[PDB]
From a paper:
Modification of streptomycin and spectinomycin by O-phosphorylation or O-nucleotidylation prevents the drugs from binding to their respective binding sites on the ribosome (for reviews, see Refs. 9 and 10). In the apo state, [name] has a monomeric two-domain structure with the active site located between an N-terminal adenylyltransferase domain and a C-terminal helical domain. We here present crystal structures of wild type (WT) [name] with ATP or ATP and streptomycin and of an active-site mutant in complex with ATP and streptomycin or dihydrostreptomycin.
Cocrystallization of WT [name] with ATP and magnesium yielded well-diffracting crystals. The crystals grew in a new space group, P32, with two molecules in the asymmetric unit, and the complete atomic structure could be built and refined to 1.9-Å resolution. The two molecules of [name] display close-to-identical structures (root mean square deviation (r.m.s.d.) of 0.1 Å over 261 Cα atoms). This structure represents a native state of the enzyme prior to binding of aminoglycoside substrate. The structure shows clear electron density for ATP and two magnesium ions in the interdomain cleft. In the N-terminal domain, Asp-47, Asp-49, and Glu-87 together with the phosphates of ATP coordinate the two magnesium ions. In addition, the phosphates make interactions with Ser-36 and Ser-46 in the N-terminal domain and Arg-192, Lys-205, and Tyr-231 in the C-terminal domain. The ribose is in C2′ endo conformation with both hydroxyl groups involved in hydrogen bonding to Asp-130. The adenine base is in syn conformation, packing between Leu-133, Leu-166, Thr-189, Arg-192, Ile-193, and Phe-202, and makes a single hydrogen bond to Thr-196 of the protein.
Author numbering: 2 to 262
Write the structure that this text describes.
């Protein structure tokens, strides 16, 4: 059975207790997933949590949850003992049976700290990534509360998983679309490519390793720089590298499979 890294156990139990208390009667399950469970937990890595609830959260619960999580989470890399939390909240009725795309009730994350610390909360909204989240959780997750994933959710049809995997390819078309987030986008494309070719999910680092031998050397060099930075082995000047990142994004759009291999 999958294990929680000892070094995040205390904070993970604190998040679970806070979520449980605030949601109360409406809570159906809490699952830990992502690199803490699947592998590749780096110093900057967040703690990924999915919260399944039965009824929508009141305007008051949402505010309580957001403000409290703010105090349970720290910006990534700030502390080795207090990681960034990502908490995604979803109605059970959006997943069983599936709505495509599913909506998420709310998402807490450090990239939203400046808004969340002012009381500005993203509202419920459609999110194709929820299909990827549940698919990943069905394979690799730990139920902190409620039932194990394979007993709670059902897999999405392959056709919808395909649409969800390819949807972010339209997010990146311009230079400004990718500027500021360069290595993240390069590694995500590597993972998307990996999943479409194998049907499987793997870490950012392993996805880069898998893709590198299949690339012309110019594109492997960009992927290598992105992997290197993510592993903390070298910080590049990504303004200088931006034109090559745009070429890499275009190369992935041209070459990533359009159907599962
Ligand atoms: N093919 C894919 N495989 C995995 N994640 C993918 C893929 N395509 C898109 N993603 C999305 O990218 C995000 C990855 O989340 P996250 O950054 O927490 O990754 P991680 O594996 O936990 O690594 P880290 O340790 O850097 O947090 C999720 O929203 C996930 O659904
Ligand atoms: Cl690890
Ligand atoms: Mg993560
Ligand atoms: Mg995350």
């Amino acid at each position: 059975t999958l294990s929680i890294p000892p070094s995040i156990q205390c904070q993970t139990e604190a998040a679970c207790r806070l979520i449980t208390r605030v949601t109360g009667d409406t809570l159906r399950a809490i699952h830990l997933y992502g690199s803490a469970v699947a592998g590749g937990l780096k110093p900057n890595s967040d703690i990924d949590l999915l919260v399944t609830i039965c009824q929508p959260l009141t305007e008051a619960q949402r505010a309580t949850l957001m403000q409290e999580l703010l105090a349970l989470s720290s910006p990534p890399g700030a502390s080795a003992e207090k990681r960034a939390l990502e908490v995604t909240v979803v109605l059970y009725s959006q997943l069983v049976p599936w709505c495509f795309p599913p909506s998420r009730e709310m998402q807490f994350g450090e990239w939203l700290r400046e808004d969340i610390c002012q009381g500005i909360y993203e509202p419920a909204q459609q999110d194709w990534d929820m299909v990827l989240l549940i698919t990943q959780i069905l394979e690799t997750s730990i139920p902190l509360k409620g039932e194990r994933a394979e007993r709670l959710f059902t897999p999405a049809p392959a056709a919808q998983l395909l649409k969800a995997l390819r949807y972010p390819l339209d997010l990146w078309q311009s230079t400004a679309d990718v500027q500021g987030d360069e290595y993240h986008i390069v590694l995500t494309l590597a993972r998307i490519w990996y999943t479409l070719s194998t049907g499987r999910f793997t870490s950012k680092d392993a996805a880069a390793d898998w893709l590198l031998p299949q690339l012309p050397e110019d594109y492997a060099a960009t992927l290598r720089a992105a992997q290197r930075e993510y592993l903390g082995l070298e910080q590049q000047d990504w303004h200088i590298l931006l034109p090559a990142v745009v070429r890499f994004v275009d190369f992935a759009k041209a070459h990533i499979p359009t159907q599962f291999t």
